[PDB]
mmCIF file of C-alpha atoms in Angstrom:
data_model
loop_
_atom_site.group_PDB
_atom_site.id
_atom_site.type_symbol
_atom_site.label_atom_id
_atom_site.label_comp_id
_atom_site.label_asym_id
_atom_site.label_seq_id
_atom_site.Cartn_x
_atom_site.Cartn_y
_atom_site.Cartn_z
ATOM 1 C CA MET C 1 24.522 5.122 -0.610
ATOM 2 C CA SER C 2 20.845 5.130 0.532
ATOM 3 C CA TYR C 3 18.039 7.336 1.719
ATOM 4 C CA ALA C 4 17.850 5.098 4.799
ATOM 5 C CA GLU C 5 21.403 5.814 5.968
ATOM 6 C CA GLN C 6 21.810 9.449 4.776
ATOM 7 C CA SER C 7 18.462 11.298 5.129
ATOM 8 C CA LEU C 8 16.086 9.180 7.303
ATOM 9 C CA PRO C 9 17.643 9.449 10.749
ATOM 10 C CA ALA C 10 17.162 13.206 11.052
ATOM 11 C CA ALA C 11 13.819 13.195 9.222
ATOM 12 C CA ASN C 12 12.322 10.826 11.732
ATOM 13 C CA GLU C 13 13.992 12.697 14.621
ATOM 14 C CA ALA C 14 11.964 15.661 13.392
ATOM 15 C CA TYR C 15 8.749 13.611 13.030
ATOM 16 C CA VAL C 16 9.283 12.332 16.568
ATOM 17 C CA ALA C 17 10.043 15.814 17.915
ATOM 18 C CA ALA C 18 6.691 16.900 16.288
ATOM 19 C CA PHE C 19 4.927 13.680 17.461
ATOM 20 C CA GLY C 20 2.673 15.311 20.130
ATOM 21 C CA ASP C 21 -0.202 13.112 21.337
ATOM 22 C CA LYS C 22 -0.140 10.592 18.513
ATOM 23 C CA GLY C 23 1.648 8.178 20.806
ATOM 24 C CA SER C 24 -1.630 6.793 22.121
ATOM 25 C CA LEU C 25 -3.755 6.283 19.070
ATOM 26 C CA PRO C 26 -5.012 2.733 19.073
ATOM 27 C CA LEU C 27 -5.287 0.078 16.359
ATOM 28 C CA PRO C 28 -8.781 0.257 14.785
ATOM 29 C CA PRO C 29 -8.984 3.213 12.352
ATOM 30 C CA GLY C 30 -11.049 6.145 13.671
ATOM 31 C CA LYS C 31 -12.956 7.000 10.455
ATOM 32 C CA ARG C 32 -13.518 3.350 9.579
ATOM 33 C CA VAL C 33 -11.988 3.946 6.159
ATOM 34 C CA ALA C 34 -9.702 1.941 3.964
ATOM 35 C CA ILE C 35 -7.926 3.870 1.229
ATOM 36 C CA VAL C 36 -6.981 1.841 -1.823
ATOM 37 C CA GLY C 37 -4.505 3.892 -3.825
ATOM 38 C CA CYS C 38 -1.843 3.455 -6.379
ATOM 39 C CA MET C 39 1.757 3.461 -5.069
ATOM 40 C CA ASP C 40 2.693 6.506 -7.213
ATOM 41 C CA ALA C 41 5.284 8.636 -5.464
ATOM 42 C CA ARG C 42 3.376 11.847 -6.084
ATOM 43 C CA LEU C 43 0.304 10.805 -4.056
ATOM 44 C CA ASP C 44 0.050 11.143 -0.338
ATOM 45 C CA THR C 45 -3.084 9.443 0.790
ATOM 46 C CA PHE C 46 -2.892 11.360 4.075
ATOM 47 C CA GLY C 47 -2.646 14.968 2.952
ATOM 48 C CA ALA C 48 -4.387 14.604 -0.432
ATOM 49 C CA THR C 49 -7.433 13.599 1.580
ATOM 50 C CA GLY C 50 -7.387 15.201 5.057
ATOM 51 C CA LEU C 51 -6.657 11.938 6.777
ATOM 52 C CA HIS C 52 -4.268 12.033 9.753
ATOM 53 C CA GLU C 53 -2.646 9.484 11.938
ATOM 54 C CA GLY C 54 -5.156 6.866 13.143
ATOM 55 C CA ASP C 55 -8.018 7.801 10.807
ATOM 56 C CA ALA C 56 -7.853 5.266 7.967
ATOM 57 C CA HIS C 57 -6.104 2.279 6.552
ATOM 58 C CA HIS C 58 -3.734 2.947 3.694
ATOM 59 C CA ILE C 59 -3.526 0.083 1.214
ATOM 60 C CA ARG C 60 -1.260 0.865 -1.746
ATOM 61 C CA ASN C 61 0.060 -1.191 -4.652
ATOM 62 C CA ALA C 62 1.136 -0.785 -8.289
ATOM 63 C CA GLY C 63 -1.903 0.700 -9.999
ATOM 64 C CA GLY C 64 -3.975 0.948 -6.844
ATOM 65 C CA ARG C 65 -5.741 -2.261 -7.786
ATOM 66 C CA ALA C 66 -8.597 -3.675 -5.710
ATOM 67 C CA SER C 67 -7.918 -7.366 -6.462
ATOM 68 C CA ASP C 68 -4.408 -6.997 -5.108
ATOM 69 C CA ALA C 69 -5.696 -5.025 -2.128
ATOM 70 C CA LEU C 70 -8.416 -7.535 -1.322
ATOM 71 C CA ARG C 71 -6.522 -9.529 1.324
ATOM 72 C CA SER C 72 -5.653 -6.308 3.156
ATOM 73 C CA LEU C 73 -9.277 -5.217 2.877
ATOM 74 C CA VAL C 74 -10.698 -8.380 4.291
ATOM 75 C CA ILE C 75 -8.421 -7.895 7.296
ATOM 76 C CA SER C 76 -9.243 -4.166 7.607
ATOM 77 C CA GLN C 77 -13.009 -4.927 7.613
ATOM 78 C CA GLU C 78 -13.415 -8.212 9.532
ATOM 79 C CA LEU C 79 -10.717 -7.542 12.110
ATOM 80 C CA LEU C 80 -10.635 -3.741 12.420
ATOM 81 C CA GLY C 81 -12.718 -0.600 11.337
ATOM 82 C CA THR C 82 -13.980 -0.321 8.441
ATOM 83 C CA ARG C 83 -17.151 0.044 6.451
ATOM 84 C CA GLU C 84 -15.761 2.497 3.957
ATOM 85 C CA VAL C 85 -13.480 2.062 0.986
ATOM 86 C CA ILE C 86 -12.160 4.935 -1.069
ATOM 87 C CA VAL C 87 -10.330 3.817 -4.330
ATOM 88 C CA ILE C 88 -7.777 6.175 -5.823
ATOM 89 C CA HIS C 89 -6.263 5.678 -9.224
ATOM 90 C CA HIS C 90 -4.285 8.467 -10.758
ATOM 91 C CA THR C 91 -3.433 10.164 -13.928
ATOM 92 C CA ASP C 92 -0.024 9.399 -15.535
ATOM 93 C CA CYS C 93 -0.074 5.923 -13.953
ATOM 94 C CA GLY C 94 2.887 3.623 -14.744
ATOM 95 C CA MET C 95 0.289 0.918 -15.371
ATOM 96 C CA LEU C 96 -0.939 2.723 -18.496
ATOM 97 C CA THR C 97 2.463 2.247 -20.099
ATOM 98 C CA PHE C 98 2.808 -1.561 -20.363
ATOM 99 C CA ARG C 99 1.433 -5.077 -20.713
ATOM 100 C CA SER C 100 2.248 -8.104 -18.595
ATOM 101 C CA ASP C 101 4.001 -10.042 -21.326
ATOM 102 C CA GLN C 102 6.180 -6.998 -22.117
ATOM 103 C CA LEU C 103 7.227 -6.815 -18.493
ATOM 104 C CA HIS C 104 7.821 -10.568 -18.351
ATOM 105 C CA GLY C 105 10.177 -10.440 -21.353
ATOM 106 C CA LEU C 106 11.997 -7.512 -19.742
ATOM 107 C CA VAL C 107 12.695 -9.024 -16.387
ATOM 108 C CA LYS C 108 13.643 -12.174 -18.358
ATOM 109 C CA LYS C 109 16.466 -10.222 -19.968
ATOM 110 C CA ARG C 110 17.924 -9.395 -16.462
ATOM 111 C CA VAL C 111 17.726 -12.717 -14.594
ATOM 112 C CA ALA C 112 18.826 -16.355 -15.076
ATOM 113 C CA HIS C 113 16.632 -18.801 -17.088
ATOM 114 C CA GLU C 114 15.859 -20.709 -13.940
ATOM 115 C CA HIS C 115 13.606 -17.796 -12.814
ATOM 116 C CA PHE C 116 11.566 -17.302 -16.017
ATOM 117 C CA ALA C 117 8.850 -19.513 -14.543
ATOM 118 C CA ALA C 118 8.597 -17.083 -11.607
ATOM 119 C CA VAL C 119 8.372 -13.857 -13.691
ATOM 120 C CA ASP C 120 5.736 -15.542 -15.876
ATOM 121 C CA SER C 121 3.467 -16.079 -12.865
ATOM 122 C CA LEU C 122 2.969 -12.324 -12.157
ATOM 123 C CA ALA C 123 -0.292 -10.845 -13.328
ATOM 124 C CA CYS C 124 0.747 -7.195 -13.446
ATOM 125 C CA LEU C 125 -2.838 -5.852 -13.503
ATOM 126 C CA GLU C 126 -2.115 -3.061 -16.086
ATOM 127 C CA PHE C 127 -4.938 -0.955 -17.497
ATOM 128 C CA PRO C 128 -5.483 1.107 -20.598
ATOM 129 C CA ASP C 129 -7.825 3.723 -19.050
ATOM 130 C CA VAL C 130 -7.594 5.516 -15.720
ATOM 131 C CA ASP C 131 -11.294 6.044 -15.204
ATOM 132 C CA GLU C 132 -12.492 2.635 -16.461
ATOM 133 C CA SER C 133 -9.935 1.050 -14.090
ATOM 134 C CA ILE C 134 -11.588 2.991 -11.269
ATOM 135 C CA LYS C 135 -15.095 2.045 -12.344
ATOM 136 C CA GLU C 136 -13.959 -1.590 -12.717
ATOM 137 C CA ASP C 137 -12.248 -1.662 -9.308
ATOM 138 C CA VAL C 138 -15.143 0.023 -7.511
ATOM 139 C CA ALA C 139 -17.731 -2.338 -9.073
ATOM 140 C CA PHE C 140 -15.576 -5.367 -8.338
ATOM 141 C CA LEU C 141 -15.470 -4.472 -4.648
ATOM 142 C CA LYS C 142 -19.127 -3.507 -4.631
ATOM 143 C CA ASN C 143 -19.889 -7.080 -5.586
ATOM 144 C CA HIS C 144 -17.169 -8.988 -3.930
ATOM 145 C CA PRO C 145 -18.876 -11.417 -1.519
ATOM 146 C CA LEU C 146 -15.890 -11.228 0.875
ATOM 147 C CA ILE C 147 -16.515 -7.468 1.297
ATOM 148 C CA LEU C 148 -19.288 -6.610 3.696
ATOM 149 C CA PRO C 149 -22.651 -5.784 2.101
ATOM 150 C CA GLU C 150 -23.033 -2.468 4.024
ATOM 151 C CA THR C 151 -19.685 -1.074 2.801
ATOM 152 C CA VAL C 152 -19.771 2.390 1.179
ATOM 153 C CA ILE C 153 -17.423 2.333 -1.753
ATOM 154 C CA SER C 154 -16.248 5.207 -3.942
ATOM 155 C CA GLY C 155 -13.546 5.750 -6.533
ATOM 156 C CA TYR C 156 -11.547 8.833 -7.388
ATOM 157 C CA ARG C 157 -9.079 9.873 -10.050
ATOM 158 C CA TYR C 158 -6.239 11.641 -8.378
ATOM 159 C CA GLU C 159 -4.906 14.225 -10.855
ATOM 160 C CA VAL C 160 -1.109 14.527 -10.518
ATOM 161 C CA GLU C 161 -1.314 17.840 -12.384
ATOM 162 C CA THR C 162 -3.875 19.621 -10.168
ATOM 163 C CA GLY C 163 -3.741 17.498 -6.991
ATOM 164 C CA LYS C 164 -7.534 17.111 -7.274
ATOM 165 C CA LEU C 165 -9.451 13.964 -6.423
ATOM 166 C CA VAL C 166 -12.288 13.716 -8.871
ATOM 167 C CA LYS C 167 -15.315 11.547 -8.112
ATOM 168 C CA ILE C 168 -15.605 8.772 -10.777
ATOM 169 C CA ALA C 169 -17.785 6.229 -8.902
ATOM 170 C CA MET P 1 -23.018 8.386 5.366
ATOM 171 C CA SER P 2 -19.257 8.512 4.522
ATOM 172 C CA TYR P 3 -15.935 10.259 4.828
ATOM 173 C CA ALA P 4 -15.989 10.604 1.044
ATOM 174 C CA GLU P 5 -19.200 12.686 0.943
ATOM 175 C CA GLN P 6 -18.798 14.663 4.228
ATOM 176 C CA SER P 7 -15.174 15.506 4.866
ATOM 177 C CA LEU P 8 -13.163 14.818 1.665
ATOM 178 C CA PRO P 9 -14.354 17.602 -0.647
ATOM 179 C CA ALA P 10 -13.048 20.457 1.516
ATOM 180 C CA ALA P 11 -9.938 18.543 2.623
ATOM 181 C CA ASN P 12 -8.800 18.128 -0.945
ATOM 182 C CA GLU P 13 -9.809 21.700 -1.823
ATOM 183 C CA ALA P 14 -7.302 22.662 0.850
ATOM 184 C CA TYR P 15 -4.621 20.246 -0.428
ATOM 185 C CA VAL P 16 -5.139 21.701 -3.907
ATOM 186 C CA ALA P 17 -5.042 25.301 -2.618
ATOM 187 C CA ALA P 18 -1.688 24.331 -0.933
ATOM 188 C CA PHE P 19 -0.578 22.402 -4.065
ATOM 189 C CA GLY P 20 2.453 24.490 -4.964
ATOM 190 C CA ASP P 21 4.726 23.374 -7.747
ATOM 191 C CA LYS P 22 3.862 19.730 -7.198
ATOM 192 C CA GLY P 23 1.766 19.817 -10.349
ATOM 193 C CA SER P 24 4.726 18.908 -12.518
ATOM 194 C CA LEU P 25 6.462 16.139 -10.698
ATOM 195 C CA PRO P 26 6.918 13.266 -13.099
ATOM 196 C CA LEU P 27 6.437 9.499 -12.802
ATOM 197 C CA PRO P 28 9.770 7.892 -11.746
ATOM 198 C CA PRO P 29 10.405 8.457 -8.020
ATOM 199 C CA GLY P 30 13.128 11.028 -7.289
ATOM 200 C CA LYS P 31 14.926 9.171 -4.424
ATOM 201 C CA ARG P 32 14.643 5.807 -6.162
ATOM 202 C CA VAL P 33 13.009 4.384 -3.051
ATOM 203 C CA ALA P 34 10.171 1.974 -2.490
ATOM 204 C CA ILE P 35 8.623 1.992 0.950
ATOM 205 C CA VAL P 36 7.041 -1.266 2.025
ATOM 206 C CA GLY P 37 4.904 -0.538 5.049
ATOM 207 C CA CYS P 38 2.013 -1.929 6.926
ATOM 208 C CA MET P 39 -1.372 -0.343 6.203
ATOM 209 C CA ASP P 40 -1.802 0.694 9.892
ATOM 210 C CA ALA P 41 -3.717 3.948 10.133
ATOM 211 C CA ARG P 42 -1.245 5.473 12.562
ATOM 212 C CA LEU P 43 1.669 5.369 10.094
ATOM 213 C CA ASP P 44 2.256 7.981 7.481
ATOM 214 C CA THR P 45 5.049 6.809 5.265
ATOM 215 C CA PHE P 46 5.530 10.381 4.028
ATOM 216 C CA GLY P 47 5.949 12.352 7.255
ATOM 217 C CA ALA P 48 7.311 9.524 9.444
ATOM 218 C CA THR P 49 10.193 9.439 7.024
ATOM 219 C CA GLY P 50 11.090 12.785 5.392
ATOM 220 C CA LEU P 51 9.539 11.781 2.073
ATOM 221 C CA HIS P 52 7.462 14.264 0.062
ATOM 222 C CA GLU P 53 5.514 14.139 -3.129
ATOM 223 C CA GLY P 54 7.509 12.462 -5.920
ATOM 224 C CA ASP P 55 10.314 11.041 -3.771
ATOM 225 C CA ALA P 56 9.413 7.368 -3.251
ATOM 226 C CA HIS P 57 6.957 4.643 -3.971
ATOM 227 C CA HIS P 58 4.548 3.784 -1.194
ATOM 228 C CA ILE P 59 3.549 0.112 -1.159
ATOM 229 C CA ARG P 60 1.271 -0.779 1.733
ATOM 230 C CA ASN P 61 -0.657 -3.890 2.769
ATOM 231 C CA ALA P 62 -1.902 -5.678 5.893
ATOM 232 C CA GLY P 63 1.241 -6.326 7.904
ATOM 233 C CA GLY P 64 3.539 -4.537 5.497
ATOM 234 C CA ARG P 65 4.517 -7.875 4.003
ATOM 235 C CA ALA P 66 7.171 -8.174 1.289
ATOM 236 C CA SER P 67 5.697 -11.238 -0.452
ATOM 237 C CA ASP P 68 2.451 -9.374 -0.971
ATOM 238 C CA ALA P 69 4.335 -6.259 -2.087
ATOM 239 C CA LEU P 70 6.528 -8.152 -4.525
ATOM 240 C CA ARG P 71 4.470 -7.527 -7.674
ATOM 241 C CA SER P 72 4.454 -3.778 -6.940
ATOM 242 C CA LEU P 73 8.183 -3.940 -6.287
ATOM 243 C CA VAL P 74 9.007 -5.646 -9.507
ATOM 244 C CA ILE P 75 7.112 -2.867 -11.291
ATOM 245 C CA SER P 76 8.727 -0.086 -9.191
ATOM 246 C CA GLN P 77 12.249 -1.426 -9.982
ATOM 247 C CA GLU P 78 12.086 -2.675 -13.595
ATOM 248 C CA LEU P 79 9.767 0.014 -14.924
ATOM 249 C CA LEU P 80 10.510 3.036 -12.718
ATOM 250 C CA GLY P 81 14.122 2.741 -11.433
ATOM 251 C CA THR P 82 14.236 2.245 -7.677
ATOM 252 C CA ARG P 83 17.219 0.588 -6.211
ATOM 253 C CA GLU P 84 16.196 1.072 -2.623
ATOM 254 C CA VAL P 85 13.635 -0.681 -0.481
ATOM 255 C CA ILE P 86 12.801 0.386 3.050
ATOM 256 C CA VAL P 87 10.521 -2.142 4.928
ATOM 257 C CA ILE P 88 8.433 -0.844 7.796
ATOM 258 C CA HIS P 89 6.594 -3.094 10.172
ATOM 259 C CA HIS P 90 5.116 -1.626 13.299
ATOM 260 C CA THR P 91 4.410 -2.240 16.892
ATOM 261 C CA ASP P 92 0.808 -3.112 17.876
ATOM 262 C CA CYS P 93 0.255 -4.680 14.410
ATOM 263 C CA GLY P 94 -3.169 -6.263 13.747
ATOM 264 C CA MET P 95 -1.252 -9.193 12.279
ATOM 265 C CA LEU P 96 0.056 -10.141 15.728
ATOM 266 C CA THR P 97 -3.507 -10.800 16.911
ATOM 267 C CA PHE P 98 -4.688 -13.682 14.688
ATOM 268 C CA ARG P 99 -4.078 -16.784 12.592
ATOM 269 C CA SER P 100 -5.333 -17.467 9.074
ATOM 270 C CA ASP P 101 -7.655 -20.309 10.021
ATOM 271 C CA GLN P 102 -9.210 -18.126 12.756
ATOM 272 C CA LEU P 103 -9.927 -15.429 10.209
ATOM 273 C CA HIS P 104 -11.260 -17.984 7.723
ATOM 274 C CA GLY P 105 -13.773 -19.324 10.271
ATOM 275 C CA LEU P 106 -14.814 -15.748 11.077
ATOM 276 C CA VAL P 107 -15.537 -14.543 7.597
ATOM 277 C CA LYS P 108 -17.262 -17.931 7.114
ATOM 278 C CA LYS P 109 -19.740 -16.936 9.806
ATOM 279 C CA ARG P 110 -20.701 -13.769 7.798
ATOM 280 C CA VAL P 111 -21.056 -15.037 4.227
ATOM 281 C CA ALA P 112 -22.947 -17.794 2.359
ATOM 282 C CA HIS P 113 -21.492 -21.361 2.124
ATOM 283 C CA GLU P 114 -20.875 -20.880 -1.564
ATOM 284 C CA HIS P 115 -17.985 -18.499 -0.699
ATOM 285 C CA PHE P 116 -16.154 -20.632 1.882
ATOM 286 C CA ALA P 117 -13.866 -21.884 -0.891
ATOM 287 C CA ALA P 118 -12.891 -18.244 -1.562
ATOM 288 C CA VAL P 119 -12.176 -17.326 2.083
ATOM 289 C CA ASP P 120 -10.101 -20.475 2.463
ATOM 290 C CA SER P 121 -7.773 -19.407 -0.343
ATOM 291 C CA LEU P 122 -6.441 -16.307 1.507
ATOM 292 C CA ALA P 123 -3.032 -16.646 3.100
ATOM 293 C CA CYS P 124 -3.281 -13.804 5.618
ATOM 294 C CA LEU P 125 0.469 -13.610 6.267
ATOM 295 C CA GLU P 126 0.207 -13.139 10.108
ATOM 296 C CA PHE P 127 3.275 -13.067 12.283
ATOM 297 C CA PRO P 128 3.994 -13.673 15.940
ATOM 298 C CA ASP P 129 6.935 -11.231 16.282
ATOM 299 C CA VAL P 130 7.345 -7.701 14.927
ATOM 300 C CA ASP P 131 11.091 -7.715 14.556
ATOM 301 C CA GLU P 132 11.421 -11.267 13.224
ATOM 302 C CA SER P 133 8.802 -10.411 10.595
ATOM 303 C CA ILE P 134 11.041 -7.519 9.580
ATOM 304 C CA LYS P 135 14.193 -9.624 9.518
ATOM 305 C CA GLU P 136 12.295 -12.283 7.543
ATOM 306 C CA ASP P 137 10.867 -9.787 5.044
ATOM 307 C CA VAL P 138 14.181 -8.007 4.539
ATOM 308 C CA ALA P 139 16.096 -11.315 4.011
ATOM 309 C CA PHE P 140 13.411 -12.609 1.661
ATOM 310 C CA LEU P 141 13.765 -9.545 -0.561
ATOM 311 C CA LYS P 142 17.542 -9.589 -0.234
ATOM 312 C CA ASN P 143 17.468 -12.990 -1.863
ATOM 313 C CA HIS P 144 14.528 -12.734 -4.147
ATOM 314 C CA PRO P 145 15.888 -13.328 -7.650
ATOM 315 C CA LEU P 146 13.213 -11.013 -9.135
ATOM 316 C CA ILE P 147 14.614 -8.117 -7.095
ATOM 317 C CA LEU P 148 17.692 -6.518 -8.609
ATOM 318 C CA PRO P 149 21.016 -7.626 -7.131
ATOM 319 C CA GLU P 150 22.246 -4.055 -6.457
ATOM 320 C CA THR P 151 19.164 -3.121 -4.384
ATOM 321 C CA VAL P 152 19.827 -1.597 -0.979
ATOM 322 C CA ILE P 153 17.314 -3.078 1.442
ATOM 323 C CA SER P 154 16.617 -2.136 5.065
ATOM 324 C CA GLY P 155 13.921 -2.831 7.614
ATOM 325 C CA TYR P 156 12.531 -0.720 10.414
ATOM 326 C CA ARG P 157 10.148 -1.159 13.307
ATOM 327 C CA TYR P 158 7.891 1.819 13.399
ATOM 328 C CA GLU P 159 6.949 2.403 17.049
ATOM 329 C CA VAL P 160 3.323 3.655 17.286
ATOM 330 C CA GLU P 161 4.105 4.813 20.843
ATOM 331 C CA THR P 162 7.150 7.038 20.083
ATOM 332 C CA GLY P 163 6.780 7.575 16.317
ATOM 333 C CA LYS P 164 10.361 6.286 15.955
ATOM 334 C CA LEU P 165 11.660 4.130 13.152
ATOM 335 C CA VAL P 166 14.189 1.775 14.631
ATOM 336 C CA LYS P 167 16.729 0.020 12.411
ATOM 337 C CA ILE P 168 16.221 -3.793 12.623
ATOM 338 C CA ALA P 169 17.957 -4.904 9.380
#
């Protein structure tokens, strides 16, 4: 049926049984960090980077794209933490494999004509190169006037093969 | 200076040293699950819910809002086979504490007039109630024509006090 019904109830029971003192961590992130990472199932933005409960904000979307993450970032900065952004794109990203029009035409084949207008309004934010997408996203944020001027910003290629985060910008 | 320079290099070294057979997990998520969770630092969408590398997509934004997550979801479903969505909003969410106009006026106080237009274009997606925001996000996705009709969809309140995920819809 679902992961939610079958596996989750015991898995959380365990997480709760292991929950220790985490009950009393407050809202603003301790390390003043916002992670911007792709949503790829193989990446855990906690463990891959030594971050534990309460340390950093975890913003994740298809591709790990800054533009998409910007609203979350503005909130993370201006309301909470955070004067650090770490960008993580990864290797074998699903966003290397397609173009927005291809996706449009696909979803079009699986939904009524009355929703074609809707599909056609999604910028997917695909990229042809993992590292250039990192460079581009870092730069973007480094100049985005809605991001604070003192923000430290860096970008890493997560390698799904090694598990290594490799400094790109 | 930064978490990236000081603490990350050894933390990943460790994650890599512990990186067992995870090197060879492929792209499509194993459990066919997309998590939609708030970006709150105290929530780990892996451990809080027995999910490990390769199992599920992790889509995270300020509030854990579906509308914002929709583009990622369309990609997760149509490109990478996922017929489950679990929504997680949490308790002590930063999105309970403000309204979009308040945030606009704030960021306005910290940036040149020439960018007021930009600030003013952000719908922050605040909510007054944690559970209603879950109900609302679940329902929304349950009727969104761009989400596949067979998708199992559920919504949970993560409690930052207990660590418990509590079925809301």
